[PDB]
Design a protein around this nucleic acid. Structure first.
Length: 111
DNA sequence: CAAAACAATATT
DNA sequence: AATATTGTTTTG
């Protein structure tokens, strides 16, 4: 997680996503934020990332997606395989699936 | 030099 | 209100 000041991000990104996926099942209709509001809570009370806010919990995770989709279409030569990058990719895929599953439900309700 | 990721902002 | 985005900072 880049941030204003940090030593290693790639590590933080994985740690953050490692929590979202582990809590992808958790979800409340009453309050959507109730989710991201919990991730930033356990992400700073266990991972010790630093400081995050509900809103920030929606921008950070969101940003990681844009990159995941961008580097997903690239699939171009000139890059080497890595364990860290591989894990992050897997975590993103799992999280992406959960988001899609929830979206499908919406379509069922309407049309 | 360039891309990635955050944190806040712009747009719907 | 919710999301991708936009500006700035960090990583590569």
């Amino acid at each position: 997680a880049k941030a204003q000041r940090t030593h290693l991000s790639l590590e933080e990104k994985i740690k953050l996503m490692r929590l979202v996926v582990r809590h992808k099942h958790e979800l409340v209709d009453r309050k959507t934020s109730e989710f991201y509001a919990k991730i930033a809570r356990i992400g700073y009370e266990d991972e010790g990332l630093a400081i995050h806010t509900e809103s920030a919990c929606r921008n950070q995770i969101i940003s990681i997606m844009r990159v995941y989709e961008q580097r997903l279409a690239h699939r171009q030569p000139g890059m080497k395989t890595t364990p860290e990058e591989d894990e992050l990719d897997q975590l993103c895929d799992e999280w992406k699936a959960r988001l899609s599953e929830l979206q499908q439900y919406r379509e069922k309700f309407l049309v």
